Design a binder for this molecule. Sequence first.
Ligand SMILES: Nc1ncnc2c1ncn2[C@@H]1O[C@H](C[C@@H](N)CC[C@H](N)C(=O)O)[C@@H](O)[C@H]1O
Length: 248
Amino acid sequence: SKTINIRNANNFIKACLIRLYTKRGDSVLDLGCGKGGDLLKYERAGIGEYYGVDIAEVSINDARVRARNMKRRFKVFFRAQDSYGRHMDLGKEFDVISSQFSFHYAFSTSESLDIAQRNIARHLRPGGYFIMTVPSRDVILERYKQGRMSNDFYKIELEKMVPMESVREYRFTLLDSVNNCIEYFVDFTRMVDGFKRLGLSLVERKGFIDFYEDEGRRNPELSKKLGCLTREESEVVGIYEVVVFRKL
Ligand SMILES: Nc1ncnc2c1ncn2[C@@H]1O[C@H](C[C@@H](N)CC[C@H](N)C(=O)O)[C@@H](O)[C@H]1O
């Protein structure tokens, strides 16, 4: 693959995010878990329980097979359902709720973002954390203004016609990944506010490149266990940001 380093970075970043906010015996709710790659990261993290939820039943399947054939200490649970725009109640809270590269899908409509925020808040133990990695609207528009919105690895198109600050969705393509996939912008303020009203407060917001470099010059061990990036790959990785809220 040509995307390898980008995948390596992204996973590295995720593993770090997981290292920072998880502890042994912790309970995790993975929203938009996808095929379930993070299972390993969590297994190293030493958590005691993993609940994967994802609208795509095809992906849950993969995660089931994944969990079924891996070396893991934690118990697992999986469910194919919409955890953002449809009420969700699992009957229990979690120490940590994670949404990796998926929460922006919660922004389809004001109603949808709401149902999602409520679902998040009702499955989170008081004091617990809600970690995520979402595309940065601010970054995406500034690149828009710079004129460059693509390279050999990806492409982005704004569903415009009409202020760019008024645009709420765009098309995303990633080499060896999604194709012309439609994404919703993350209305950051509206998000923060909703969560605020729900008892969750913002405790962290940092970009992929800096966070990467920082955590990198912080433990060169997991790194080598990585490398450097080309300006091109860095543009892809430079799209996302880390965002954490905590239930107080
Ligand atoms: N409304 C939704 N409810 C639950 N999962 C969703 C929803 N919309 C999209 N998704 C999932 O979001 C996932 C996003 C993928 N980028 C996630 C990959 C995985 N979390 C990773 O970190 O590699 C897809 O697998 C979808 O099935």
